[PDB]
């Protein structure tokens, strides 16, 4: 099995001109500087770029790349894309589920992992948790081994690796490469790229390629690179690293002069007489994606439990501040105070939903181009795994605690209307948080955006300005605010049977107005309906704002530039 | 001029045993792994650690280190401690001001820079801005040159460098080291430490030292390290880097075996017969520190102007939402709504004052141990440079815009009471932000803490809960809240002459209470004084909370573990 390619022009700006060569079944290496194309050619051969940006061909065993090529090959991203919150046995049963056939047995899913984890030397760390900052786990040298086993499930013949040495120590990385050297002879074509290599790494290759500022300088087997650059005019001095002496040529102990040597290279001319011979299921896809982030959710107390501890404590403090809300003249200020405080929590804690996708963005990109899932199966699964339980709970933790301490309206249904309303505004402000943050790798931008947006929703929620007393070319903005509809519903839920002028039965007559002596007089003066549609109008507003903002999140995850 | 040392035990945990050697006037190099003591010994000889943690001696030319040793020597931190927002001519006039004598002429301050910037090759980039992420400037290879010139002002004979190669490219770092090689012969003793060195770097030294896991393995000149480790049992193979072959010994192609070779090293025995021969003004300090951060403040529109654009726009939006606050039944909700919104801005924008010290923490540590300032001179200067102008302005931008659009109380003094009150709560919430964040290098912790603290101040400010209706074992917490005192003052400033029941003169009698038909009835019911002390009580509360929280910030910057 061989790779091959010819006349590749890649632009957005051509940081390449054309690259020519073939890659044998063996150990294919790309070296050079970071500004060079050493990271861009590898995304070309692994089809990780825009095909309209691509110009030339990729021909494999006399066949072009099909749609089946990504589904039988493996590229490994430079950072740890593994689930360090899970273990190796758990994570390799994930990648067995979405890559092996549905017809294949769970026994076969038990065995084919064990043909691989036994090969990687990871039999010690099978059920050992891989490792987080906050949970001690396996050393990072086998986190690199963990991701390679994630890309060896269906036995891909063609292996790709983004920077197998960077991120690891010196003898740490050698145990990776000898494992890859064991893979170098079992019929597995490893094609990778190393910044700042070493002669201990250099002594074990099979083929080699140098790129510098988008220009090609070497092709062929790896031994003869030292043999060729002697004829270029240099000499490798006594006791120098050869892989570092290969970069001694580059930056002036000019680029146009060295490439003209390569056009007249006999290593090119054999390749010139070689390339022109050549150029001449969904329920299962939701069964295991929901489980994987679920064990991410259990395997992080500092993000799951630590947001319950904030919820329980602030559940109890608000239980102590308010405590039996009186039906006196101060009663309106307290009841409208806590319900404005709950809804804004619900909203200002939904900024933590941006922690979900932005951290999982780079894992989303690699896993879909690999083809582990349809995008909706990611999207009907992770919302089942993280959007559902982490927002059902604080909408019950707030609801069970602060209801009977404060003495909010002592009926059965209104306990559950408040339970459901905080549940929706938790979802709805999370959905907007997903809608903005979908397809953004930056945190500090989108976190600032919702912080702007929620504040411009806080004003129109009804407490900080009376919504009927806004100029009528702004009173259309009161519809675009999630803290309005929840806080409208909670004010609708609670202020119905209440009274606030003790001694003054107001429901028959209110003598001496400007008084606000019943709950309806507060509720109408805020511009809120009294018919029972006016409660659930808010929910179907919020239900539509969930579906719209998830769809904008679904389209941004669909129309994303994955390449 | 030589350094020397003997029998150094350093604990908190002894990650050392004892290190012996001298350092000639030349080029002194420390190599090894990151877990080794190669970064810890350099802080020992430059006195950057706890002297109680130190055991042995540091003897210089037959004299111990005085208090004058830090005032005539230079250590350069690994990251860019330069002011990339300023230029080289501006930044080297800073380090000329705080290091040269007060008797020395400004002409001499013009000349001695020009003896150095001419030496560094930085004459092209003299007035060129050095560089930010958001302002294009000089390349990072001369940012490293910029910091060395900051530590060559009073001509220190003894130079120290934290990691002179890390952070720069290959040929980028050589132009640094050849400059240091030019310094290696002008009578300047450079003592540094390099992770992952190279033979182009290795071929120019004068003395050499290896550390590994707190153990010493070499001392002497740099040529003979390749000569010595042959006798240890190895041989440097054909075409290998010698400085990388010196780490080939370390991690098993054990630590106790290789150190016993060094006890029986003849390079140690000459040193054993060499060490035992040896062992046998404030206004000026505020004149220029205030200027330097001032030009940091001008040289960052994305942090200075971008917090005015937010202030002007939200100045205008609040001008449009409210716009001529009516004296009707909704008038209480609007006026108490905006004043609660202004004070919480003032407070929740003071979270951006944590951006000040936490970023400038590592520059504060290096510059005080160098001795550029007394700590109060840093502290009376930077508050003059950043705390003063960036909080005088939005307390005028809010004040000029939203006063006459909204029609807040049309008197002359109340315009300036509101101007001054927003100025204090800007300072006071910034002072707490300085008091918490002083001595913390983490951002995400302290930003979370004030976000917790301001929310537990937002409740007690008086809008979300009526303060008189709290249980009396919590009504002492209403004093520990900055958004109370400002919002108390703004409610005191504005609700005096107002009326809110139109048609109903309330100041003679209020028939039919529960009404809130004048501004005092709202103001008393919140539990706020009506005497004119009750206004300025809030200010002297806030003035004391500035001085206390700055003192806690002054003590945390004083009692900090600088080492």
């Amino acid at each position, epitope marked *: 099995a061989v790779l091959s390619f010819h006349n590749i022009c890649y632009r957005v700006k051509e940081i390449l001109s054309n690259i020519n060569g073939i890659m044998k079944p063996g150990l294919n290496a790309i070296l050079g500087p970071t500004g060079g194309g050493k990271s861009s050619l590898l995304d070309v051969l692994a089809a990780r770029k825009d095909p309209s940006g691509l110009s030339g061909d990729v021909l494999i065993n006399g066949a072009p790349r099909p749609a089946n090529f990504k589904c039988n090959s493996g590229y490994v991203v430079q950072d740890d894309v593994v689930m360090g919150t899970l273990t190796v046995r758990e994570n390799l049963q994930f990648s067995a589920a979405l890559r092996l056939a549905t017809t294949m047995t769970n026994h076969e899913k038990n065995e084919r992992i064990n043909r691989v984890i036994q090969e990687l030397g990871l039999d010690k760390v099978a059920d050992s948790k891989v490792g987080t900052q906050f949970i001690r786990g396996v050393s990072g040298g086998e986190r690199k081994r963990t991701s390679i086993g994630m890309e060896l499930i269906t036995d891909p013949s063609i292996l790709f690796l983004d920077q197998p040495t960077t991120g690891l120590d010196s003898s740490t990385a050698n145990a990776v490469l000898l494992l890859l050297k064991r893979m170098s002879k079992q019929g597995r074509t490893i094609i990778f790229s190393i910044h700042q290599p070493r002669y201990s790494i250099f002594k074990l290759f099979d083929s080699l390629t140098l790129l510098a500022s988008g220009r090609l300088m070497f092709h062929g087997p790896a031994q003869e690179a030292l043999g060729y650059f002697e004829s270029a005019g240099y000499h490798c001095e006594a006791y120098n690293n050869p892989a570092d002496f290969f970069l001694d040529i580059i930056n002036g102990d000019l680029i146009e002069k060295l490439a003209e040597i390569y056009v007249n290279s006999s290593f090119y001319k054999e390749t010139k007489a070689e390339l022109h011979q050549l150029s001449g299921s969904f329920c299962h896809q939701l069964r295991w994606v929901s489980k994987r982030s679920f064990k991410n959710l259990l395997g992080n107390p500092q993000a799951s439990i630590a947001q319950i501890i904030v919820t329980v404590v602030l559940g109890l403090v608000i239980g102590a501040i308010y405590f039996g809300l009186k039906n006196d003249s101060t009663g309106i200020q307290n009841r409208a105070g806590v319900l404005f405080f709950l809804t804004t929590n619900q909203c200002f804690s939904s900024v933590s939903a941006v922690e979900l996708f932005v951290v999982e963005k780079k894992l989303f990109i690699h896993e879909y181009i690999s083809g582990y899932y349809r995008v909706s199966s990611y999207f009907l699964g992770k919302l089942l795994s993280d959007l559902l339980p982490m927002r059902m709970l604080p909408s019950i933790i707030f609801t069970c605690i602060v209801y009977f301490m404060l003495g909010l309206k002592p009926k059965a249904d209104a306990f559950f209307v408040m339970m459901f309303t905080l549940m929706m505004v938790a979802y709805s402000a999370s959905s907007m948080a997903l809608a903005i943050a979908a397809g953004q790798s930056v945190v500090s931008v989108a976190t600032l955006l919702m912080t702007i947006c929620f504040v411009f929703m806080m004003i129109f929620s009804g407490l900080l300005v009376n919504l*009927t007393t806004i100029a009528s070319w702004l009173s259309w903005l009161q519809y675009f605010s999630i803290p309005r509809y929840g806080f409208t519903a909670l004010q609708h839920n609670e202020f119905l049977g209440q009274n606030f002028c003790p001694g003054l039965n107001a429901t*028959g*007559n*209110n*003598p*001496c*107005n*400007y008084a606000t002596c019943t709950g*309806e*007089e507060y509720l*109408v003066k805020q511009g809120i*309906d*009294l018919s029972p549609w006016g409660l659930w109008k808010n929910h179907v507003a919020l239900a539509c704002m969930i579906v719209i903002f998830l769809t904008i999140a679904y389209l941004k995850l669909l129309f994303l530039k994955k390449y | 001029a030589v350094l020397s040392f003997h029998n150094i035990c350093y604990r908190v945990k002894e990650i050392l045993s004892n290190i012996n050697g001298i350092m000639k006037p030349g080029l002194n190099a420390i190599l090894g792994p990151t877990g080794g003591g190669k970064s810890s010994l350099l802080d020992v000889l430059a006195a950057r650690k706890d002297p109680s943690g130190l055991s042995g001696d540091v003897l210089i030319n037959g004299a111990p280190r005085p208090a004058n040793f830090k005032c005539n020597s230079g250590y350069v931190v690994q990251d860019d401690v330069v002011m990339g927002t300023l230029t080289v001519r501006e930044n080297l006039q800073f380090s000329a001001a705080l290091r040269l004598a007060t008797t020395m002429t400004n002409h001499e301050k013009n000349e001695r820079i020009n003896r150095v910037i001419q030496e560094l090759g930085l004459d092209k980039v003299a007035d060129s801005k050095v560089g930010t992420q958001f302002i294009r400037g000089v390349s990072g290879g001369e940012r490293k040159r910029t910091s060395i010139g900051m530590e060559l002002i009073t001509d220190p004979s003894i130079l120290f460098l934290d990691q002179p190669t890390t952070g720069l490219d290959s040929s980028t770092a050589n132009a640094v080291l050849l400059l240091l090689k030019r310094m290696s012969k002008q009578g300047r003793t450079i003592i540094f430490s390099i992770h992952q060195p190279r033979y182009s770097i290795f071929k120019l030294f004068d003395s050499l030292t290896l550390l590994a896991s707190g153990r010493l393995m070499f001392h002497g000149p740099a040529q003979e390290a390749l000569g010595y480790f042959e006798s240890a049992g190895y041989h440097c193979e054909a075409y290998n880097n010698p400085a990388d072959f010196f780490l080939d010994i370390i991690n098993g192609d054990l630590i106790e075996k290789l150190a016993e070779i060094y006890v029986n090293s003849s390079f140690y025995k000459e040193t054993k017969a060499e060490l035992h021969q040896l062992s046998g003004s404030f206004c000026h300090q505020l004149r220029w520190v205030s200027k330097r951060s001032f030009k940091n403040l001008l040289g960052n529109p994305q942090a200075s102007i971008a917090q005015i654009i937010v202030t002007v726009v939200l100045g205008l939006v609040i001008g449009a939402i409210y716009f001529g606050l*009516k*004296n*009707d039944s909704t008038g209480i909700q609007n006026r108490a709504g905006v004043l609660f919104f202004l004070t919480t801005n003032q407070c929740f924008s003071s979270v951006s004052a944590v951006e000040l010290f936490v970023v400038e923490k590592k520059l504060f540590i290096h510059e005080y141990i160098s001795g550029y300032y007394r700590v109060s001179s840093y502290f009376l200067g930077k508050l003059l440079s950043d705390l003063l102008p960036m909080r005088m302005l939005p307390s005028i931008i809010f004040t000029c815009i939203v006063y006459f659009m909204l029609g807040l109380k049309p008197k002359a003094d109340a315009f300036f009471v509101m101007m001054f009150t927003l100025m204090m709560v800007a300072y006071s919430a910034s002072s707490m932000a300085l008091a918490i964040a002083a001595g913390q290098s983490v951002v995400s912790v302290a930003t979370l803490l004030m976000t917790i603290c301001f929310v537990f101040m937002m409740i007690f400010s008086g809008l979300l809960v009526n303060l008189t209706t709290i249980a009396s074992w919590l009504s002492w917490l209403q004093y520990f809240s900055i958004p109370r005192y400002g919002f108390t003052a703004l409610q005191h400033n504005e609700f005096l002459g107002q*009326n809110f*029941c*139109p*048609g*109903l*003169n309330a100041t003679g009698n209020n*028939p*039919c209470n529960y*009404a809130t038909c004048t501004g005092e009835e709202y103001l008393v019911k919140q539990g706020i004084d009506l005497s004119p002390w009750g206004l300025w009580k809030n200010h002297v509360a806030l003035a004391c909370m500035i001085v206390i929280f700055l003192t806690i910030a002054y003590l945390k910057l004083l009692f900090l573990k600088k080492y």
Partner: antibody
Amino acid sequence: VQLQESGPGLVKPSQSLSLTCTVTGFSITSDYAWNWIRQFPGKKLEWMGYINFDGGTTYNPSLRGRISITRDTSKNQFFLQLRSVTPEDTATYYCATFYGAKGTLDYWGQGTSVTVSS
Amino acid sequence: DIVLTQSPSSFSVSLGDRVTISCKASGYILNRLAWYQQKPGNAPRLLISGATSLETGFPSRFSGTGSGKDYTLSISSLQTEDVGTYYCQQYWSTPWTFGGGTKLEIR
């Protein structure tokens, strides 16, 4: 308690209008808010805007920039200055009296008619 | 704003009849619903404040029974002196719109 208008019962179009409501039995600086009412032929009432007891005022937002109410406190008067008068608003005008706490138009004027023709 | 549709713009009743004048609101008024009575050539005399109260200077026949939006006036066994033009007013908001004003007749 006792209100009365006195003004021109005619005007040229598109210039101005002046009415004056002199209040006896009570002082307009004491308690209430003081508002004007017009009633069209083809009778539909249309409240116009109140001046408060302390000179503040709020006008009916259909009549923006056209109505203004001033007051001369030293003899208990408050003035109707209605500018750029179209011939369509040839209504019967009134001055009236608002309690604030009772909430209703408790006392009214006598009734002045304005005909806007030429 | 709040418009006050007196949907029965007129009537045709006889003496001693219980007539019921509706006043449909375009929003919740919460008993802030006045009633006036303009005899021809006069200013509107106030009849009922609060939508349930009454004003001194009338028999106990005029009686408002309103709730929510559907406010109405009940005139049990009207007299000769009670034909007029009954205007309902909201005094909830600031643009105090009145009703269209029904007008009683005699068959």
